[PDB]
DNA sequence: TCCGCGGCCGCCCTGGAGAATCCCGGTGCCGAGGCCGCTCAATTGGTCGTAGACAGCTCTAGCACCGCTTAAACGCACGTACGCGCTGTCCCCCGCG
DNA sequence: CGCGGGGGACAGCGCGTACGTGCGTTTAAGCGGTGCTAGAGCTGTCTACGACCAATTGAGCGGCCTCGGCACCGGGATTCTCCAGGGCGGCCGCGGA
């Protein structure tokens, strides 16, 4: 989040975005939310409402059940 | 043939540029290293803030630029154009320093 | 940071500074002699600055401290803390 | 001695070329100044004082001149020797990778 | 940090004249005197003329946030300058009758 390119490449005059990665990290929902903002900036910064509060199997199932469309 | 400019040709547009532009011309981190190394002798382990450093470099830059202009005036007075040690010492002495 | 940083004002830096004075050629021994002149001026300013800092019961040196240090030079024109 | 001509051919003028110009816009960004609180010493009033020029003597030396007596200036004539002109030398940092 | 080199720093010697130094003879100041009077100046004075806190007060500020401007290249002949042929400053030399 604190990176310079986080703000550098988030304000381009481009109508479409494409992101390629090897494999996103399973834990540390911070970078998952960061990528969610990278694809397009609409999601709220509060990632603790969906998960991160309360178990691992349910947490990962909910994590996979919210990023399915993209 | 390569477009090798004669010495003193680029200087025209160069002085056109840097007379209008008003940015710095000295590396910052070596300068703060210098001011530290001169400060510890007077007072060790000084807790330097972000300020009190740019003012010193600006002041010394203005003083040395004035001295260099005076030295250029002395060199032109010496029926020449280049700088030398004697021009600098004469300009400094006539400045009261 | 504390060892041989007098070369911070480099030879290309001195050449660029002399460019602002209006000179075409800068001799080889110009760089170190103007380095010594800068060292002398900086030492003269900072001696007064640190003495004022000791007088003011202060451990840190502020910009206004060197402003007063240069004040008794006798010009005192515009600048921060003027 | 005329001068025909031929040569050393290389230099300002001309044409071609290299990089920048400082605005027209795009995109993105950037902290002045008025506005809910405020606060706080300013602005008159009354008292306090006080000293600092209005006279007034005062006092003391400025000054312009009258009348001698020199002192460097001034012109001139020659000396000379060193800045300057002219020219030659070398040099080492600027432009570029 | 490295190299080509070329305009520029630095010197050798002639010019000659431009001060510099040695001749007389001044123009105006220094000194002795002076007779005054004209400016510089503190004392009775007394008044007006400055300072400071009560009731109010306004006025500029303490803090945020919009938005018309900052920064400079897409966009680029001309400016700025540099470098290769042409006609030429002509220069000059040498030789039949």
mmCIF file of N, CA and C in Angstrom, chain B residues 15 18 61 64-76 81 83, chain C residues 14-24 26:
data_model
loop_
_atom_site.group_PDB
_atom_site.id
_atom_site.type_symbol
_atom_site.label_atom_id
_atom_site.label_comp_id
_atom_site.label_asym_id
_atom_site.label_seq_id
_atom_site.Cartn_x
_atom_site.Cartn_y
_atom_site.Cartn_z
ATOM 1 N N UNK B 15 23.357 28.727 -20.733
ATOM 2 C CA UNK B 15 23.136 29.839 -19.817
ATOM 3 C C UNK B 15 21.740 30.412 -20.007
ATOM 4 N N UNK B 18 19.917 27.672 -17.523
ATOM 5 C CA UNK B 18 20.110 27.668 -16.076
ATOM 6 C C UNK B 18 20.010 29.054 -15.448
ATOM 7 N N UNK B 61 26.167 28.819 -1.307
ATOM 8 C CA UNK B 61 26.057 28.887 -2.760
ATOM 9 C C UNK B 61 25.962 30.329 -3.234
ATOM 10 N N UNK B 64 29.451 31.992 -2.740
ATOM 11 C CA UNK B 64 30.448 31.558 -3.709
ATOM 12 C C UNK B 64 30.094 32.005 -5.121
ATOM 13 N N UNK B 65 28.805 32.123 -5.445
ATOM 14 C CA UNK B 65 28.426 32.623 -6.763
ATOM 15 C C UNK B 65 28.780 34.100 -6.893
ATOM 16 N N UNK B 66 28.544 34.883 -5.836
ATOM 17 C CA UNK B 66 28.981 36.276 -5.851
ATOM 18 C C UNK B 66 30.497 36.370 -5.985
ATOM 19 N N UNK B 67 31.223 35.515 -5.259
ATOM 20 C CA UNK B 67 32.680 35.507 -5.361
ATOM 21 C C UNK B 67 33.133 35.117 -6.764
ATOM 22 N N UNK B 68 32.435 34.172 -7.396
ATOM 23 C CA UNK B 68 32.799 33.747 -8.743
ATOM 24 C C UNK B 68 32.519 34.842 -9.763
ATOM 25 N N UNK B 69 31.419 35.578 -9.593
ATOM 26 C CA UNK B 69 31.155 36.711 -10.475
ATOM 27 C C UNK B 69 32.216 37.793 -10.307
ATOM 28 N N UNK B 70 32.612 38.071 -9.063
ATOM 29 C CA UNK B 70 33.685 39.035 -8.829
ATOM 30 C C UNK B 70 34.999 38.550 -9.434
ATOM 31 N N UNK B 71 35.270 37.248 -9.332
ATOM 32 C CA UNK B 71 36.478 36.676 -9.914
ATOM 33 C C UNK B 71 36.461 36.774 -11.434
ATOM 34 N N UNK B 72 35.298 36.555 -12.049
ATOM 35 C CA UNK B 72 35.175 36.731 -13.493
ATOM 36 C C UNK B 72 35.408 38.184 -13.886
ATOM 37 N N UNK B 73 34.881 39.121 -13.093
ATOM 38 C CA UNK B 73 35.141 40.534 -13.348
ATOM 39 C C UNK B 73 36.631 40.840 -13.262
ATOM 40 N N UNK B 74 37.311 40.271 -12.263
ATOM 41 C CA UNK B 74 38.753 40.467 -12.137
ATOM 42 C C UNK B 74 39.502 39.862 -13.318
ATOM 43 N N UNK B 75 39.078 38.680 -13.771
ATOM 44 C CA UNK B 75 39.724 38.040 -14.912
ATOM 45 C C UNK B 75 39.569 38.878 -16.173
ATOM 46 N N UNK B 76 38.365 39.400 -16.418
ATOM 47 C CA UNK B 76 38.166 40.310 -17.543
ATOM 48 C C UNK B 76 39.032 41.550 -17.372
ATOM 49 N N UNK B 81 39.942 35.820 -19.879
ATOM 50 C CA UNK B 81 38.576 35.371 -19.632
ATOM 51 C C UNK B 81 38.527 34.217 -18.637
ATOM 52 N N UNK B 83 39.459 31.643 -15.375
ATOM 53 C CA UNK B 83 39.716 31.790 -13.950
ATOM 54 C C UNK B 83 41.115 31.279 -13.618
ATOM 55 N N UNK C 14 31.989 22.071 -8.266
ATOM 56 C CA UNK C 14 32.690 23.352 -8.268
ATOM 57 C C UNK C 14 32.699 23.955 -9.668
ATOM 58 N N UNK C 15 32.855 23.117 -10.695
ATOM 59 C CA UNK C 15 32.810 23.613 -12.068
ATOM 60 C C UNK C 15 31.444 24.208 -12.392
ATOM 61 N N UNK C 16 30.371 23.530 -11.975
ATOM 62 C CA UNK C 16 29.025 24.054 -12.182
ATOM 63 C C UNK C 16 28.817 25.357 -11.420
ATOM 64 N N UNK C 17 29.345 25.440 -10.198
ATOM 65 C CA UNK C 17 29.243 26.674 -9.427
ATOM 66 C C UNK C 17 29.981 27.817 -10.114
ATOM 67 N N UNK C 18 31.163 27.534 -10.666
ATOM 68 C CA UNK C 18 31.910 28.552 -11.396
ATOM 69 C C UNK C 18 31.221 28.924 -12.703
ATOM 70 N N UNK C 19 30.400 28.022 -13.250
ATOM 71 C CA UNK C 19 29.602 28.365 -14.422
ATOM 72 C C UNK C 19 28.668 29.534 -14.136
ATOM 73 N N UNK C 20 28.182 29.647 -12.902
ATOM 74 C CA UNK C 20 27.285 30.727 -12.514
ATOM 75 C C UNK C 20 28.006 32.055 -12.329
ATOM 76 N N UNK C 21 29.335 32.053 -12.290
ATOM 77 C CA UNK C 21 30.090 33.284 -12.177
ATOM 78 C C UNK C 21 30.431 33.882 -13.526
ATOM 79 N N UNK C 22 30.293 33.085 -14.584
ATOM 80 C CA UNK C 22 30.565 33.554 -15.928
ATOM 81 C C UNK C 22 31.991 33.307 -16.380
ATOM 82 N N UNK C 23 32.481 32.085 -16.187
ATOM 83 C CA UNK C 23 33.846 31.723 -16.545
ATOM 84 C C UNK C 23 33.810 30.601 -17.573
ATOM 85 N N UNK C 24 34.757 30.646 -18.510
ATOM 86 C CA UNK C 24 34.860 29.635 -19.556
ATOM 87 C C UNK C 24 35.720 28.447 -19.141
ATOM 88 N N UNK C 26 38.079 26.532 -15.950
ATOM 89 C CA UNK C 26 38.373 26.401 -14.527
ATOM 90 C C UNK C 26 39.627 25.553 -14.382
#
